[PDB]
Amino acid sequence: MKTVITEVIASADSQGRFLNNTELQAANGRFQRATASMEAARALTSNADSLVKGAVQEVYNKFPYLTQPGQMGYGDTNQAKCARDISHYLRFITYSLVAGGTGPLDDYIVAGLREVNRTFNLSPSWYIEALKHIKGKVGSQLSGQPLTEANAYIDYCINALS
Amino acid sequence: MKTVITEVIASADSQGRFLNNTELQAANGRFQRATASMEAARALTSNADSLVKGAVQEVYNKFPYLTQPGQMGYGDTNQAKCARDISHYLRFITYSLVAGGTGPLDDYIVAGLREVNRTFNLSPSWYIEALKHIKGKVGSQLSGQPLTEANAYIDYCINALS
Amino acid sequence: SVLTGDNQQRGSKLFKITIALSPTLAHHPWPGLDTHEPSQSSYSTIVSLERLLPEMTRIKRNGGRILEITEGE
Amino acid sequence: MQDAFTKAIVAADLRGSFLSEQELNQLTNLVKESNKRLDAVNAITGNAAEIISDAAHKLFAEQTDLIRPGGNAYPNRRMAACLRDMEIILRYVSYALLAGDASVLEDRCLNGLKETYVALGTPTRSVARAVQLMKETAIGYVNSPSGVTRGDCSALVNEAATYFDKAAASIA
Amino acid sequence: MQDAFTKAIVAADLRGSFLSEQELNQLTNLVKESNKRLDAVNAITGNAAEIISDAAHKLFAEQTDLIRPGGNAYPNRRMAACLRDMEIILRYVSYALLAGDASVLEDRCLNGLKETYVALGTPTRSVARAVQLMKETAIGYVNSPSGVTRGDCSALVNEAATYFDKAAASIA
Amino acid sequence: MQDAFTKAIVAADLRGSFLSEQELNQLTNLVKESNKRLDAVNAITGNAAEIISDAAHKLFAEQTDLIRPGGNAYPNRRMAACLRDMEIILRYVSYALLAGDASVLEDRCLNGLKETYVALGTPTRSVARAVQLMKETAIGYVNSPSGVTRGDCSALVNEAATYFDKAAASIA
Amino acid sequence: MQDAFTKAIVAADLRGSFLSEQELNQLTNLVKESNKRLDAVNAITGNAAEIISDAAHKLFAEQTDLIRPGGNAYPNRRMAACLRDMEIILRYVSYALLAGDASVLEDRCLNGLKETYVALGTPTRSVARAVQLMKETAIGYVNSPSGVTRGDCSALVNEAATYFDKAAASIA
Amino acid sequence: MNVLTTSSQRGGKLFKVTMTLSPALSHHPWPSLDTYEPSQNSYSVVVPLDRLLAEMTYIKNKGGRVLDISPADLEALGPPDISSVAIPLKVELWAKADVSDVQAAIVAAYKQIFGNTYVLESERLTSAESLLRNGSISVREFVRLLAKSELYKERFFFCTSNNRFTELNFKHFLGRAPYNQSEIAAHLDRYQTFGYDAEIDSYIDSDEYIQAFGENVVPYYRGFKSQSGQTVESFNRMFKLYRGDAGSDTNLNLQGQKRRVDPKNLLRSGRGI
Amino acid sequence: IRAAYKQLFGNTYILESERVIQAESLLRNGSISVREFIRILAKSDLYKERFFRCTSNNRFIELNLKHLLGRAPYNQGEIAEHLDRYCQSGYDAEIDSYIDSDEYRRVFGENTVPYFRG
């Protein structure tokens, strides 16, 4: 899993050399930032649910036809799934904030994203909206660096999805 | 040349991916620290000379026989060289503080250290003393993080020399 | 071989080398005596300084000799 | 490799001297801007996919032939390459932007690029065009973000430009 | 690989849940100690060469045979190996110390080490001994540095120990 | 590799004899069925994507846990693998079906497979299940095609089954 | 077997020396704590049945599948085993706790356990989980008893933890 | 050792158990001290699932400790078929290769370079692939890139021990399995001073790599057929390094990176260092 | 084989038909511990139908305790312990319990024919 701390170790390890000043500097960075990161996570964790509802919803407004019978958005099972999924995305995001690296995201969400989505015919687009809508809401509860961090990670997914 | 900034780029580059949050965190670290680093450099740069004199000197006290005829420490040429050399070490150290990485040290001083020293029969020991004596003096002009940084780098050489 | 960009990910000064090619250096995976390529009898490569010495020594013990050396940039 | 700091060092080395106090003050101030610098980078990386997507659309609206049979962007295979390439260039540019130095960009990326394009029969002109298209879009984001402390980024903006342009030039 | 943070995540994942507030407070406090943590590492790395040198001397004063003809540290070639080994172990330990987790150490350094030693005919016991010798010296530095703000490092000191010990145990 | 023809040869070789007339008549008949045989294969390949897609859906409807945190199909990464695997197995099966021999399937695919799955902690049971799910769907197509001359394919259908089953068994 | 006392002896033996006075004082103090030590053990043994019962309930509430057809805890037969196992581990842990040493636990109990679980197809993860569940409940009693002289047991509590954890780790 | 029957008279899943024997477990019927026979230093028992518990407790109560337990079904399975690797195949990238021929080489490389191990699309390296097919990079140079890539380090070198990584490397870069302790030693020393990169470089640089599939030929399994200066034991080692097809070098599996080749086996072939 | 037969059997005559060849096979091979060989005997129908049926539960317990171990039974209670097993668990277990018992293992534990150390 890719976090700041793991990487520097890795790099140090590869070269076969002790952790010198170079790496520590880097580590320090991660730790200083954490305070902001941590804050953001506490904020998302708390409002989770509400964000999720809002997102799921949005998607349907954006793509009305999904709710019609014979479509994917139709029938509760699918709706449940849709909810679940977004929860996940969120969950991971929090994780990543705390871990101080994309790592968590990469391994759970991103790697293999495409094929999953292809084989089940999930349109990336949807997820994206979810995220965007989220981003917009988050853009109220948070501010300053905490916010900035939240964004970074949220986006990172947008980019991976698209 | 190995500095915080160069490395993250390198790692990013290898994977073939954009600089994401992970790396920036690291970079940030380097920059925050710099203020202390920079201070240290200004202090060494100023007292350079005096440190050099003191060191060279020390070495001779430590190893009297060097100053005897037929030895290495004997005859001005050699003394001049001895001075020059230590200057160098210092010079680089400053560099490294500023660059925020061992890089400068590695490429100038460390790489090929052994063989040079072998072929000219320079005993690492000597240099070491120089450094140690220095470290001791530096341990007055500086304080707190600035100091800590100075040490790290000074040492790094001790370890490379030995 | 024209370099599209710096070939090598690890970074140093890079130097193009042109070599006459022995059969041994690039044996084709074929029955009977191996034959080096028809098109390139002069493989041209971009090498880092660090690797330069190893590359050259391996080239040297193999039959083929450096036609020329040029800096890669 | 190289970057702003390392560079200044190297110069100093050849003179054989400690860093001039004047020179330190270049770096001292450079540090201060960091925060700005960073956000700039962040903005690019954050929007990456889009930047490209956008630029492409415009590229192909302009030079219709590229996408027509016999053109360079046809068929799929080729198209893909062309997209990938744009991205790469971008990636590098970003790198530079962080480093505070062209080098990385020049050395890893730009060097030999032209010649490649030539050998393939890719029209260098069009490539260059794309680079610019990208440039403008990118700046767009760098310069209009959300949640960032309001202030002047011009200095960085221009340096960004330059990088794009070195790219454009050496390809072209 | 793994470290303190990642680990806690993973646990949380399998439960399928967002992080407990309680759990955050583990990490929150862990952060606070960082500074201490770091210096600890720094101390080791700074003294590395010495730590080893020292430990060796003592190792060989004790087990004279190792250095005698027919022993395992004789001749030069072997000696060299033995030194190299010690170093490695150390290196890893350090790594762990930073991560805040044994894992890294266990996987690349410890796993299968015993068996190697066995196959070679290297006496596992002596190796273990050396590890400890190292431990004590190392702690020596961690715990008595110069120019650092005075406070309590015990917590870290003990964790350091543990790492050394996992090493000692799995080798032995 | 091996297939129906080659096989019979090999047997004959060890006896040291020309092919028995009886044995020829196995192959002679086998030839006659070719056309049927072929179409069977064609049907699988034609529907491939679907076969899988379908089987998966049903697999996951049954064993909900696989897709839940802590299960084997979670997270995405794993899921992907699991899909890929299914496909592979299929691919081979097809091959066999053409050859008129299990071998290819056994050797390239089934060899080592169980053990792998074990080491990973992948539940062999579930894998087997999936294979069957696939089987049924696949047969579905083989046996109900469009535009093909109507006749009896049973013989082939059953042989197909067997292949699937060898798979199921050796995995399980 | 081994325990705290015996251990120290053994070490001393290889040095070839009488016990150091310092070392005695480890044991001397260890003795003093006995009474505390004992009660701790007593608490576990007294509540044994419960500890397990409890842990199980929670284990199965979490990982529903274990008890569903196709899971590892199904059917009865298996379930029984799983319960039995938990108990055993506990039993050992206790032993250790008394001895004042991991050994007994490692040697009799943990050694080979992982591999067993693997061979069976038992999911090591879940086992580990159970161990922890147990841990917490157990501590619960150790730390909150009735009729005991009030004092600090932390030292013992932590050592208890460690034992549980060695278990968790080596199984996992 | 081979186990003759997978299930017992009453249905049960037989399991091989291997233990280091102790004098109490088995002892000769002699006067003097009890001694377990030497040949049975490692002792393998086959027992139904039911007795396993009681069988192992007793072994551990005595000085015995359990080397490993394996299901008898996995055991007493054939040595893996060498069909595919007996004659590898071979992939040659001609100059002016067609788009398809380039694709074939890439796929072949990823196979042998990373073992069966699957490479996701995200994992796959566009830049390196890009360079091949324009010219400018040899297949050999592509190989180098791949070993240098983090993907490889994360799998092979970062998880497992450097003793593990060396043979893992031998197999990927050369078909061959390692012969002798010396090779393992040498590589470790190279890693200490030079670092990862130089070790990686040495394999590709080495003449053996040049003598077979030197340039523009993806590496193929030389092992499993007789090779010059190869100890017979190496052949047997290959069977340990290579298990089946669809069997990969996996950091993913439980205790994922371990040693396929036991150190004593290496020592058998050659010792001296 | 000769010895094993005698010690566990009554010293009763054993016909070639009576002898179980599958257990005898495998000894040459390996893969059967001699204690496990001896387990196969008595799990044999041969011993159960004859030397088990006729005699009372107590009888075969003493005779097992004799055939498998030299000792006759030191105390009433231990005889009773096996009697608890008769219904408690299947016969096969109880005989298995003897060879699995410690002292069977302690002396002539592995790779050894049982003897009337009594």
Ligand SMILES: *[C@H](C)[C@H]1/C(=C/c2[nH]c(/C=C3N=C(/C=C4\NC(=O)C(CC)=C4C)C(C)=C\3CCC(=O)O)c(CCC(=O)O)c2C)NC(=O)[C@@H]1C
């Ligand atoms: C919500 C915007 C839309 C929607 C989604 C939907 N998804 C599936 C099925 C899957 N979706 C995923 C996604 C994930 N599952 C994971 O485990 C992860 C990582 C944590 C992700 C991102 C996957 C893997 C599947 C396939 C297996 C599964 O059952 O989850 C469906 C069901 C389609 C099907 O069963 O074939 C649906 C409907 N639902 C909506 O209504 C929106 C359009």
Ligand SMILES: *[C@H](C)[C@H]1/C(=C/c2[nH]c(/C=C3N=C(/C=C4\NC(=O)C(CC)=C4C)C(C)=C\3CCC(=O)O)c(CCC(=O)O)c2C)NC(=O)[C@@H]1C
């Ligand atoms: C001081 C402790 C001793 C001393 C100095 C001395 N140095 C040399 C020779 C060399 N010194 C160096 C060192 C450097 N040159 C560099 O360019 C760098 C890197 C930036 C360093 C640090 C080198 C390279 C040499 C070798 C040859 C040369 O300098 O031309 C000598 C001469 C030794 C000889 O045998 O020629 C001396 C004497 N003088 C003393 O008294 C101490 C022993």
Ligand SMILES: *[C@H](C)[C@H]1/C(=C/c2[nH]c(/C=C3N=C(/C=C4\NC(=O)C(CC)=C4C)C(C)=C\3CCC(=O)O)c(CCC(=O)O)c2C)NC(=O)[C@@H]1C
């Ligand atoms: C025979 C009619 C005449 C002849 C042939 C000859 N060739 C060589 C050596 C080489 N010839 C080739 C030819 C090829 N290169 C290719 O890549 C291909 C296929 C695309 C061919 C056919 C090459 C590359 C070599 C060099 C390496 C090699 O060993 O083949 C020789 C020997 C030259 C030597 O000094 O070893 C000969 C004799 N030349 C004559 O004299 C005949 C009239």
Ligand SMILES: *[C@H](C)[C@H]1/C(=C/c2[nH]c(/C=C3N=C(/C=C4\NC(=O)C(CC)=C4C)C(C)=C\3CCC(=O)O)c(CCC(=O)O)c2C)NC(=O)[C@@H]1C
């Ligand atoms: C797209 C905006 C325009 C375009 C692109 C295009 N590129 C190729 C082929 C290549 N382009 C590259 C790019 C790079 N070379 C490097 O060194 C790097 C950085 C490491 C990059 C990004 C390379 C290597 C190739 C050749 C191989 C490949 O598959 O990319 C083509 C196809 C040419 C061919 O026939 O192979 C195209 C179309 N050209 C256009 O027409 C657009 C205007």
Ligand SMILES: *[C@H](C)[C@H]1/C(=C/c2[nH]c(/C=C3N=C(/C=C4\NC(=O)C(CC)=C4C)C(C)=C\3CCC(=O)O)c(CCC(=O)O)c2C)NC(=O)[C@@H]1C
């Ligand atoms: C420039 C194009 C736009 C802009 C930038 C801007 N940023 C700041 C200040 C900060 N920006 C950051 C961001 C980071 N620091 C990090 O460590 C990282 C990596 C994790 C990032 C992304 C930080 C921390 C600061 C300091 C606090 C803050 O956010 O205010 C400023 C303020 C001036 C300064 O130099 O700090 C500015 C102006 N703002 C604009 O108006 C441009 C559109």
Ligand SMILES: *[C@H](C)[C@H]1/C(=C/c2[nH]c(/C=C3N=C(/C=C4\NC(=O)C(CC)=C4C)C(C)=C\3CCC(=O)O)c(CCC(=O)O)c2C)NC(=O)[C@@H]1C
């Ligand atoms: C020193 C305290 C004692 C000692 C050590 C010793 N080791 C060897 C040989 C080897 N050591 C290793 C071990 C490692 N490889 C790794 O990557 C790691 C970390 C995971 C270790 C610790 C290996 C692989 C070898 C064998 C090959 C080699 O020599 O490089 C020897 C040499 C004996 C020989 O003939 O090989 C020795 C001496 N032995 C002592 O006497 C000390 C008690």
Ligand SMILES: *[C@H](C)[C@H]1/C(=C/c2[nH]c(/C=C3N=C(/C=C4\NC(=O)C(CC)=C4C)C(C)=C\3CCC(=O)O)c(CCC(=O)O)c2C)NC(=O)[C@@H]1C
């Ligand atoms: C513990 C073994 C020793 C010790 C440590 C100690 N450190 C601090 C505080 C700091 N230490 C550092 C050091 C670093 N921070 C970094 O970012 C880096 C990498 C470049 C290092 C090396 C820093 C910056 C601080 C903060 C300022 C300061 O120096 O005080 C403390 C103070 C308490 C606290 O941090 O909460 C202590 C106690 N003290 C000991 O007792 C040992 C000598």
Ligand SMILES: *[C@H](C)[C@H]1/C(=C/c2[nH]c(/C=C3N=C(/C=C4\NC(=O)C(CC)=C4C)C(C)=C\3CCC(=O)O)c(CCC(=O)O)c2C)NC(=O)[C@@H]1C
């Ligand atoms: C899906 C039906 C079930 C499942 C499967 C699963 N497999 C892996 C990993 C691997 N599986 C294989 C299989 C093959 N490799 C081959 O080359 C071939 C034949 C030629 C096959 C079929 C291998 C080698 C691996 C290892 C490489 C890899 O990990 O991709 C996993 C991933 C392991 C993990 O725990 O991450 C999984 C999940 N598991 C399920 O849950 C399904 C019931």
Ligand SMILES: *[C@H](C)[C@H]1/C(=C/c2[nH]c(/C=C3N=C(/C=C4\NC(=O)C(CC)=C4C)C(C)=C\3CCC(=O)O)c(CCC(=O)O)c2C)NC(=O)[C@@H]1C
């Ligand atoms: C069997 C599973 C189902 C079925 C098949 C079927 N096919 C034929 C006859 C033919 N089918 C083909 C098809 C091919 N021949 C080829 O060479 C290729 C690959 C290039 C294919 C796909 C051909 C040429 C024939 C012969 C001409 C014809 O179509 O009549 C039959 C008839 C039996 C026979 O040919 O001996 C049958 C039964 N049809 C079913 O009813 C099954 C569901």
Ligand SMILES: *[C@H](C)[C@H]1/C(=C/c2[nH]c(/C=C3N=C(/C=C4\NC(=O)C(CC)=C4C)C(C)=C\3CCC(=O)O)c(CCC(=O)O)c2C)NC(=O)[C@@H]1C
């Ligand atoms: C319960 C928490 C989980 C579980 C366990 C489980 N175990 C078995 C079978 C065995 N487990 C053991 C146990 C031990 N062997 C030892 O040496 C020791 C210490 C002395 C222990 C703890 C053994 C040997 C077996 C095999 C023989 C036996 O009768 O136990 C099973 C059943 C295996 C089967 O295939 O039926 C189970 C289920 N598995 C779960 O489901 C829980 C997560």
Ligand SMILES: *[C@H](C)[C@H]1/C(=C/c2[nH]c(/C=C3N=C(/C=C4\NC(=O)C(CC)=C4C)C(C)=C\3CCC(=O)O)c(CCC(=O)O)c2C)NC(=O)[C@@H]1C
């Ligand atoms: C610790 C987890 C909790 C606790 C314990 C505690 N116990 C004592 C004192 C004693 N405990 C015993 C108990 C035993 N000694 C034995 O020999 C046996 C076996 C028969 C037992 C069960 C004894 C005899 C003593 C001494 C007299 C007494 O009971 O007080 C103390 C007092 C301090 C001491 O070290 O003796 C304490 C604190 N109390 C807590 O607060 C914990 C929850």
Ligand SMILES: *[C@H](C)[C@H]1/C(=C/c2[nH]c(/C=C3N=C(/C=C4\NC(=O)C(CC)=C4C)C(C)=C\3CCC(=O)O)c(CCC(=O)O)c2C)NC(=O)[C@@H]1C
């Ligand atoms: C004496 C010259 C050296 C020595 C010997 C030594 N051996 C052991 C232990 C055992 N050695 C054997 C060997 C045999 N047992 C047999 O049955 C046979 C032949 C049929 C042999 C030759 C065995 C099996 C053991 C272990 C169990 C046992 O003692 O029966 C030791 C002691 C090891 C222990 O911990 O028990 C020793 C000391 N070792 C030396 O010190 C001399 C160099």
